[PDB]
Amino acid sequence: KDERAREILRGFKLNWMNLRDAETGKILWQGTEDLSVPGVEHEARVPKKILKCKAVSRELNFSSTEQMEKFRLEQKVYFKGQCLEEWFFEFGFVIPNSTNTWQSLIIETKFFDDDLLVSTSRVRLFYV
Amino acid sequence: SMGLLTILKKMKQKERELRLLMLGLDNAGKTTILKKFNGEDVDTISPTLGFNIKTLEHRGFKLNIWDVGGQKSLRSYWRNYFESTDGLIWVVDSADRQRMQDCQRELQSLLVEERLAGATLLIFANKQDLPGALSCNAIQEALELDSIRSHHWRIQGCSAVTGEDLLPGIDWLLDDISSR
Ligand SMILES: Nc1nc2c(ncn2[C@@H]2O[C@H](COP(=O)(O)OP(=O)(O)OP(=O)(O)O)[C@@H](O)[C@H]2O)c(=O)[nH]1
Ligand SMILES: [Mg+2]
Domain boundaries, chain A: 1-128
Contacts of A105 in chain B (CB under 8 A): 38, 54-57
Check pocket membership of B104 for ligand 1, CB cut-off 6 A: no
The strand pair at B51-55 and A98-105 is best described as parallel
Experimental technique used to determine this entry = X-ray
The closest alpha carbon to A106, from A35, A16, A28, belongs to: A28
Nearest of A42, A28, A120, A122 to residue A77 by alpha carbon? A122
H or E segment and range at residue B6: helix B3-13
Residue B8 amino acid letter: L
Topology of domain B1-180, per CATH? Answer: Rossmann fold (3.40.50)
Q: Residues A27, A29, A30, CA angle at the centre, nearest 5°? A: 90
Contact A103 B55 (CB under 8 A): yes
Stated in angstroms to one decimal place, the resolution of this structure is 2.3
Rg from Cα positions in chain B: 17
Round to whole Å and give the CA distance between A40 and A50.
23
CB neighbour list of residue B178: distance below 8 Å, 6 or more residues apart: none
Give yes or no for a contact between B103 and B25, defined as CB atoms under 8 angstroms apart: yes
Of B40, B48, B55, the CB nearest to A25: B40
Q: Cβ(B130) to ligand 1 under 6 A?
A: yes
List of chain B residues whose C-beta atoms are within 8 Å of the C-beta of residue A101: 48, 50-53
Q: Where are the domains of chain B?
A: 1-180
CA A72 to chain centre: 11
- Closest among A58, A64, A39 to A103, alpha carbons compared: A58
A89 in reach of chain B (CB within 8 A): yes
Domain A1-128: top CATH class: mainly beta
